[PDB]
Design a protein around this ligand. Structure first.
Ligand SMILES: Cc1cc2nc3c(=O)[nH]c(=O)nc-3n(C[C@H](O)[C@H](O)[C@H](O)COP(=O)(O)O)c2cc1C
Length: 147
């Protein structure tokens, strides 16, 4: 996975999200002190390109451990999850709901069982919102995690 030199406009994307004209989900106000990640929709398998400190701390993973991976690794206490695999700890419909939303650039909000690096189970109230870059096309997805 490639990462933008000098980083991502996380604050600008938060503002874009808070200002979005027809919010389909209730997110409320958010900021950089929240558990959030940004994933790149135009790299293979939608890799994490940015993780906030609060995400790293909620999950127990380091920046080196998370960047460049699809976030589905959180769905197993091993951190090992193949795409299209049936999940042991998440129901199929929730997984499919997330995938379809992301593919359609549709906002979605789910509750999913996730696991910290130490294997501790937690319930993740997850909101994903697509984000337009400077071209005006949907390029990223910003995910907001709550425990
Ligand atoms: C911005 C963003 C944040 C995500 N955060 C999480 C998360 O915290 N936990 C999780 O279980 N899945 C998360 N996902 C969902 C998975 O990465 C993946 O999209 C989901 O498993 C459905 O796709 P799949 O069928 O390829 O696995 C996130 C996805 C995106 C794009």
């Amino acid at each position: 996975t490639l990462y933008a030199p000098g980083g991502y406009d996380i604050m600008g994307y938060l503002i874009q999200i808070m200002n979005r004209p027809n919010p389909q989900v209730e997110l409320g106000p958010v900021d950089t002190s929240c558990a959030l990640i940004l994933c790149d929709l135009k790299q293979k398998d939608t890799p994490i390109v940015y993780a906030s400190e609060a995400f790293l701390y909620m999950t127990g993973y380091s920046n080196a451990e998370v960047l460049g991976r699809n976030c589905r690794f959180l769905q197993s206490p091993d951190g090992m999850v193949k795409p299209k695999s049936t999940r042991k700890y998440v129901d199929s419909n929730t997984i499919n709901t997330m995938r379809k939303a992301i593919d359609r650039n549709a906002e979605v909000q789910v509750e999913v069982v996730n696991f910290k690096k130490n294997g501790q189970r937690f319930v993740n109230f997850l909101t994903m919102i697509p984000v337009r870059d400077e071209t005006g096309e949907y390029r990223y997805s910003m995910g907001f995690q709550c425990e």
